[PDB]
């Protein structure tokens, strides 16, 4: 895993904001 999922997932959102 959940942890690794949050990272890849969370980061996925960031890439959007930027973008």
Local structure of residue 14 (DSSP, 8 states) = H
Rounded-to-10 torsion of CA 8, 12, 15, 19: 160
Q: What are phi and psi of 13, to 5 degrees?
A: -70, -40
Report the distance separating Cα 6 and Cα 13, nearest Å. Answer: 10
| Cβ count near 18 (within 10 Å) | 5
Report the distance separating Cα 14 and Cα 9, nearest Å. Answer: 9
Question: Residue 13 to residues 10, 18: CA-CA distances in angstroms?
Answer: 5, 9
């Amino acid at each position: 895993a959940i942890v690794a999922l949050v990272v890849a997932i969370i980061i996925a959102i960031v890439v959007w904001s930027i973008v």
